[model samples]
Target: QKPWWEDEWEVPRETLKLVERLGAGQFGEVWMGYYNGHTKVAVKSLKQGSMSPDAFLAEANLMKQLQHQRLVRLYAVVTQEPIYIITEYMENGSLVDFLKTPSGIKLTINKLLDMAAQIAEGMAFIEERNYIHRDLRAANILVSDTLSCKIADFGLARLIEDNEYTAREGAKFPIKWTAPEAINYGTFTIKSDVWSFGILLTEIVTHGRIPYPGMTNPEVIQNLERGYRMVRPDNCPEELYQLMRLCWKERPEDRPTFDYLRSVLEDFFTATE
Candidate 1:
């Protein structure tokens, strides 16, 4: 574990005051809190007697090293019995949840593309750094009060050198957002992350609509096996939808790199500007 005063990465538990519970997930409950009575922060307190100490520290260590404008910031970590991961709070919450609200529908085309570009930019960093986010879904992306999108939840991320990592036997993940290769063979790579980004784009353009609507997990799997891809959202730009299709191509090698994805979006915005 990193030293408490090493670099302001270990905040004092005494000064961290839990204002309210924001939400709960498989990892733990996240609370909206104030750090040192001034800075607002989100505290991810591990579930009682949950994750192992090593696993907890590993995540903290990884988060400590990752710093990007489009990625959530980890302020500090508490290694006490009930561990805590302190991060910058996103007032708007998860991207998926935000899009489901009224304001989401009011987003302009440029605004939507801006959000998508930010996510792709973050993923580009992950790809360039040789890290794979096994879990890349709308729910994992957070939105700040000013509508900035930041990638969060690195628990499932693994280094590229750890490429052989596989899910536990019969372990389940979000099916509709998972890639065909990952769902069938347990292989995950930058290409697979690209696939989830496509699904996320669909979610953005569709305002958080369920992927493969009216289909069960088994049904979606079967359909993918037969070479079916998701339809473009009615309001999605043609160019954006075309890019989304590129990410969903059947072969991993056939998919465009995140770097390319970022460039395309940047060009789009630049041309529009």
Candidate 2:
């Protein structure tokens, strides 16, 4: 299904010059654009059907309101055909892309920890704000030039009151990197995000390899239903492995809070000092 914007996508000749298509997505194209006053900006070329304008505005507005060193910053908005969302240029692109770069592929354990800590801090802020990051993935996590992480793409996400929790078909939500309960029940509470963070931990160790790489989504789902959980990598800390298991528990509420997670990471970091 072609989005409406794709039918007649164009930017005013005076707006900006699309330097290069940086990445393609399920619904739109993101490009490296050079704006008049901005040296570099990430322009999300999304069409109408790609997402409703209101939802798009919700995300854009939310980004502008967020003030975190670890969350990606939004700059400007263009609503023309193939609407462009201008944001701070991420020279490093996604954490996923960064992990694939030749220089990034050889990251030491210490370096990976730094990135993980940054991500955790960002996620903790989101949870504290009462907003759930519906989509949490390496691709959705942008890394800046200095290797800092920032959470992006709050389109599928929603801001809910602290007490107004909801759930949907878990199997229908994000599958590849989601926690077991969310994969089976669609309950994405703050604690569930903790489990997702655990999955991110695996990505840090394995360079973003799919969890249970050889298994299909159904197989992973079934394994979770049958008491199977993520198998930690040899390089991962045993304490981190325990943390991942605790987060991946079948019940969402059973998972640890980000505060506890922060304390755990802090203690672990201190132990290494």
Candidate 3:
């Protein structure tokens, strides 16, 4: 297959104006930028010496093949000193932060379901492609001006090959949204992602509240393995919470598929209709 780089997707660094820093992390910083002072874009500048060019291209190539409305679009890539990955700007920002604000407070449960369904739709596509988005929390989900939710942040994403490998014993992962097995074994699968999706359901129902309240990361891992489940969100429909429970099943194999999730959410809308 041809590469996106072959399409001349590189732009002169001077053409972009970094207006503001959107976020900064250990690996790199993302900026709210403008292309040629006219077209708005998100500029993700990676620190040099962090990842080899071959490593970056592998992920970038994977990303190029992934195209969906519910997935953030990679517009261009700049591979000079400070490597940049450019994407379309999400006006509403991260789904978690958006839901925590007043604007999101006004949304009805039905509207929230629509948003969650969109998220699942995106993940469904990823799953069919044999990719696991190890990080599936609300913070990694972005919202557009039209309230379309897209899955973002592929830092921990990996393609599952036909010959599966052994689960890593110890690796730092998101404790709150992670499956019990993943926290303890570092075993990630499409099913494990389904587990995290359930936690995302909890976040949505609670309007971006903290997951596993009153429990530390280790405690969360222990309690979940011990079969102590979290309480449903106060206002969350029992049905919605029920689906979450299904996702949080102790055994990863018992968790619902993203395809199942989408169908259930669609049923929710259909029943409401």
Candidate 4:
């Protein structure tokens, strides 16, 4: 835990009025704070990210450009010192943390499928606006108590470039949730998002465990190279397993569109008794 008053990352406590730590990451700290006399809110304070001072400006730019229920709302940014990202706070916390417990973690196939459909819907909205989430993991999506899903955090996100989708040099991403094509060609398209979404869907049913917990990077490279996929847990529905495989294909073009994914899952749910 970092001291909020530390020089390099200092955030004036006065701006928040009242605050407490909500989460911490390599980037900085997240907190719940008070605002507008009665409203309580969340704020993410990133000390010095890859984007540095411009990060606040970047977040502001990204938030206004997007609006979806499955994504968190970015209300404002505090640029005075260490920098604070103000947004609405979810009472139940992150989907990643929620999935850590079996009570709400291991869900029924119907429930899981429903949540997945919601995520895909959100992704479709984002893509229609010509943006790629780039980092589409369970940790990045938040679910409310009512099971309303939202896509959050655009710090690492990027706009879809023209006639291409290649990753720049030294991609921060790894091969875990990445598509096979992403691993080989350093490109991530709308199809690659599906591939990553497939991994996340699998994680939802697997109680939040990583797709491949302990395998070395080389193992990920080799296993994916041979088309060997991480199996859906014994309790997972066959449809989920099938979709997982379909999304794990060796090429980006083989993956389905989010719209196609949404339709397929909807049919799967309808077909359910």
- Top model number, TM-score: 1
1 versus 4: better TM-score goes to: 1
Candidate 3 Cα deviation (angstroms), residue 76: 0.7
RMSD in order of candidates? 1.9, 5.2, 2.2, 5.5
Q: After superposition, how far is residue 237 of candidate 3 from its true place, in Å?
A: 0.6
Residue range 1-273, candidate 3, lDDT tens digits: 355456577777888989999889877798998998899999988777786765665555667778788899887777677878888799999999999889999988888888888989999999998888888999999999998899997767888885132356656777788777777666778888898898999898888999877779778767776887887778889999899999988777788889989988978866764
Model 2 quality (TM-score): 0.85
lDDT of 4 by residue, 148-216 (tens): 677887876677767347876677575788777766778767777888998888777876777776787
Candidate 4: where is the Cα deviation over 4 Å?
Answer: 1-15, 48-51, 271-273
What's the best-to-worst order under lDDT?
1, 3, 4, 2
lDDT of 2 by residue, 1-273 (tens): 224355233235466778899778766788888878557878877766976766665677667557677787776676666567777788888888789889788887667776777777888888888877867878789888887778888776667766334675433666767765555556567766777887877877788777776788888778777898876676787877887787677677777877777677666666664
Predicted candidate 1 versus true structure: per-residue lDDT over 139-245, tens digit per residue: 99999999989999898888877644567658777889988888877888999999999999888888888887778988988878788787667777899888988
**Residue 161's lDDT in candidate 2:** 69
What are the per-model numbers of colliding residue pairs? 0, 1, 0, 5
The local lDDT score (0 to 100) that residue 131 gets in candidate 4 is: 82
Per-residue lDDT of 131 in model 3: 87
Off by over 4 Å in 2: 1-15, 48-51, 162-171, 270-273
Assess candidate 3 and give its lDDT: 0.83
Please give the CA lDDT of all the candidate structures. Answer: 0.85, 0.73, 0.83, 0.74
Using Cα atoms with residue i matched to residue i, what is each candidate's TM-score against the true structure? 0.93, 0.85, 0.91, 0.86
Lowest lDDT sum, 10 consecutive residues, model 2, at 1-10
